[PDB]
């Protein structure tokens, strides 16, 4: 595998975040180093994840996926913390997010157990403190729930680099979140039987050197 | 039955990652103002037949254009759209006139969507066709994340003007004409006959119809 004359197309899986999160990250590499091998990015489906990186129908998962583990190797990138957000206009912006306001907002959820991340930890620990009425919307996509946030009147939770890079660029707004939730740990997977192939190495090189934490190159 | 006003119905639409999110802030006020406790789930089109979901009702409404919804099928126009294209303002071709050549020598992002059968399968083929294989940086099935990924980098994306114009208002990315002509798009609800009678499906129907959209949200 040469980098410099490759016309690979990786096929990376993981969430419109971790897609938007990744593939930013991997431009400078490509134009420098390797000008015509594509990158994929593939959303997580409902299916067994395993089985896809098994057939090498896609390369690297990228995220957290609890369920990984069996003829799957993993390295691990770093650690997330959700936050809430909500925009400048919001009336529950004057006296904060304690968790009864909390409770009396509407809100919009990303869904995640259907696809199996850890998100679904997080969606089941606002799923069992909050008022059914007070859930107003549900995607499964983490983008388009900020973008909705940033039209409406709704609360969000989400990972806080997701929740940074959104209220940075708009009116979004962030809080603690008044409920316990876990910290996130973030990783790369991919399937023993690629463990020694040059491209999947040399890819998963390249992603374990990305700084994520400091913007793209 | 179905009375808005006190409905706790959790009504799902399939969607694009853009209709969705053009569709979803646009029912807002409609939900405050007359139906508090009514849920919508924007949910990702699939592989599998859309006609299906629509059928066992586990899908109310697909929102977009699916050619191949047909048979069994209703449909309501809503509104037309047209293509352009984006590029970051930091991007180098931002100087120089981009007519065909050098567009087919500038890096691309595609959103892929055959395998998802909807409308844009139609721009995607055409892009395929025109571009060196080469120029294809970046493959996504998310409108969104080939708009921030265009944000961050230096390549070119071909996208729905109206996601053109909401990302270009941030100021990061520039329109100018795609150098080439696209189909114009025919943006639709669809629902299964099956619930054409349903109440609560057809006053969401109802309610989408009356949406402005070529308005912000109410
Ligand atoms: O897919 C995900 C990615 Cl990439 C990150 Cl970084 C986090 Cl924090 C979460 Cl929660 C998901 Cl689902
Ligand atoms: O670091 C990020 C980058 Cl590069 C993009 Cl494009 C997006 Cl959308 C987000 Cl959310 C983050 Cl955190
Ligand atoms: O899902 C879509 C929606 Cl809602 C619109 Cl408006 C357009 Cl123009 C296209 Cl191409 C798609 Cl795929
Ligand atoms: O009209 C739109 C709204 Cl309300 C949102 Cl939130 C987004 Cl992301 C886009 Cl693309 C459009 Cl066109």
Redesign the interface.
Known sequence: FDPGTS?R?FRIAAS?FG??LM??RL?AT??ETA??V??????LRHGPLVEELESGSIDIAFGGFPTLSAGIKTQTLFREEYVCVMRQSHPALTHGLDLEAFRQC?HIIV?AHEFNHVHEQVEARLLELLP??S???????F??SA??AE????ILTIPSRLARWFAN??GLTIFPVPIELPSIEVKQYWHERYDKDPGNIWLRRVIAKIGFQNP?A
């Open positions: 016309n197309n419109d897609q938007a593939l930013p431009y490509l134009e000008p015509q594509r990158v994929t990015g593939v959303n509407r869904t059914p009425e859930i107003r919307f549900t995607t499964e996509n983008l388009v973008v909705i039209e409406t009147d709704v660029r708009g793209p």
